[PDB]
């Protein structure tokens, strides 16, 4: 219930840290694994939801296991394979392997599907899915910040544009941060609206009571946090080449 939420001190003392990996290198390895998930995900034609679920699996997996023993390039395909089954869009084992291969070795050649080499890398993916399941203690039901985004974008009568920017922030928080390991989905959703608003220069009208739009979403959320979190999210977005461009008003 609080099993998969971690303090900043626990994020510091990660399994990858115990094996040498620096704090900034680790953040990097997660961003890379997310990118790999998004890439395979779009080619396998699964939904952003299936991918987000995969990304959270990956995130939680590396709070127990280390990047030095379990390479993201091995874990991500298996995580995606599992998430697609959990989320209703099963993809075939051979299909996920072909797509993982073309993403990781664009120039290499699809191995003979009859070789003892290929047969083995199929077994390796089935072994990893089992390791992921056991590591997550079979807890595969994931709540995403998106679920709660529609709930509080009607609460600000926001345009279709403000809403689509909020989902973009939501999806990007999963790729770029570790909020999914620190804050409940409802809180992360507020952070996403709050920043989509700052970015779009949409100002929210004070409620009839005097209270603010987010109070009707999570009782724990305070402006002191929303500003600290939207600032952290914004900084990482600025470091990520071409991302802000996608939501940038060119007019």
């Amino acid at each position: 219930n609080k099993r998969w939420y971690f303090t900043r001190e626990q994020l510091e003392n990660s399994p990858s840290r115990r094996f040498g990996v620096d704090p900034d290198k680790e953040l990097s390895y997660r961003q890379q694994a997310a990118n790999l998930l998004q890439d395979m995900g779009q080619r396998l034609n699964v939904s952003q939801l299936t991918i987000n679920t995969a990304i959270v699996y990956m995130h939680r997996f590396y709070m127990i296991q280390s990047f030095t023993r379990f390479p993201g390039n091995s874990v991500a395909p298996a995580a995606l394979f599992l998430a697609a089954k959990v989320e209703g869009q099963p993809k075939k084992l051979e299909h996920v392997i072909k797509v993982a291969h073309t993403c990781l070795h664009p120039q290499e050649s699809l191995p003979d599907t009859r070789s003892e080499a290929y047969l083995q890398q199929v077994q390796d993916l089935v072994i990893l899915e089992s390791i992921i399941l056991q590591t997550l203690g079979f807890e595969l039901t994931i709540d995403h910040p998106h679920t709660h985004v529609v709930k509080c974008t009607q609460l600000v009568r926001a345009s279709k544009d403000l809403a689509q920017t909020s989902y973009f922030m939501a999806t990007n928080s999963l790729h770029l941060t570790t909020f999914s390991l620190q804050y409940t989905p409802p809180v992360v959703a507020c952070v996403c609206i709050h920043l989509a608003c700052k970015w779009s220069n949409w100002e929210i009208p004070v409620s009839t009571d005097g209270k603010h739009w987010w109070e009707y979403v999570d009782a724990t959320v305070t402006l002191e946090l929303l500003d600290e979190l939207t600032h952290e999210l914004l900084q990482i977005l600025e470091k990520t080449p071409n991302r802000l461009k996608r939501i940038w008003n060119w007019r």
């Binding site: 089935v126 899915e129 056991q134 590591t135 039901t141």
Partner: protein
């Protein structure tokens, strides 16, 4: 060689007896090595599994983790070494009790059994889930006399957008008319049909409609429930299977075994042909059957 904080090895339990044989796998009674707590261990089947961990087992596990209720069986955890589902142990199943000729049911105990069962259906349906495998063998009872709905292997979530749900569900004998007519757009009412059959079963000791094929079942249903005409089931003819086999009175056949009139009445509102006219969990729990003497009493027989 790998860390596993949240999936304990099943060796923590000590097997005592293989209590369940069939095509559902292997069910073991076991005992926690430290506390003596009894559990049911149900191994996850891997016959011809070429797509990794079985998607159907994920579904079942997803549903069990969601359903938390006094009358739904309780998944404690999941274990390894191969993979085991671990439940709180339930000593009896309703099929085994219904067959032991030495076991006897007072009417106030029958009332309580049906009450716990109907309360379990009310719960799972509120949580947007269909059981889809109603039958005596899937109703369990604990040593302390609490009834548990079990085996969610065919279970599935539902909702309300024309639904595209699968047809070959429910064992033939407890399968409801809709499914036999080839229905694909259904919901909770299919489980209540099963509850109806199980309820009658509490008096007859034997499943009441023992069909051989889908058409001999439908036949047997007619020789108990009347014919299936648009006069009884509006727009039933809208389905492309009313073709065969056609044919043109439930309280009568059950008079002998079932004496209580309120009991007979409820059985008749559950074994209704039109799903839209079939009684639901809520209204069934409110039926005078549960609110007249003898009142429902705890189980000790």
């Amino acid at each position: 060689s790998v860390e596993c904080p949240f999936c304990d090895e099943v060796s923590k339990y000590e097997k005592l007896a293989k209590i369940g044989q069939g095509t559902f796998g292997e069910v073991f009674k076991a005992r926690h090595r430290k506390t003596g707590q009894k559990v049911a261990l149900k191994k996850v089947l891997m016959e011809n599994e070429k797509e990794g961990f079985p998607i159907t087992a994920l579904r079942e596990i997803k549903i069990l983790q969601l359903l938390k209720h006094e009358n739904v069986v309780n998944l404690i955890e999941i274990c390894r070494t191969s993979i085991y589902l671990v439940f709180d142990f339930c000593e009896h199943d309703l099929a085994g009790l219904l067959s032991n000729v030495l076991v006897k049911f007072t009417l106030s105990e029958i009332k309580r059994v049906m009450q716990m069962l109907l309360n379990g259906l009310y719960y799972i349906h509120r949580n947007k889930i269909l059981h889809r495998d109603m039958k005596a063998a899937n109703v369990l009872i604990t040593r302390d006399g609490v009834l548990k709905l079990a085996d969610f292997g065919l279970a599935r979530a539902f909702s309300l957008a024309p639904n595209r749900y699968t047809n070959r569900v429910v064992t033939l004998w407890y399968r409801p008319p809709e499914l036999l007519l080839g229905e694909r757009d259904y919901g909770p009412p299919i489980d209540l049909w099963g509850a109806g059959c199980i309820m009658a079963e509490m008096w007859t000791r034997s499943p009441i409609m023992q069909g051989n094929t889908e058409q001999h079942q439908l036949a047997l249903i007619s020789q108990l429930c009347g014919s299936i005409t648009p006069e009884v089931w509006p727009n039933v003819d809208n389905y492309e299977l009313y073709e065969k086999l056609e044919l043109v009175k439930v309280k009568d056949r059950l008079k002998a075994y079932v004496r209580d009139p309120y009991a007979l009445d409820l059985i008749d509102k559950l074994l209704v042909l039109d799903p839209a006219q079939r009684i639901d969990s809520d209204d069934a729990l409110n039926h005078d059957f549960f609110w007249s003497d003898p009142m429902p009493s705890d189980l000790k027989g």
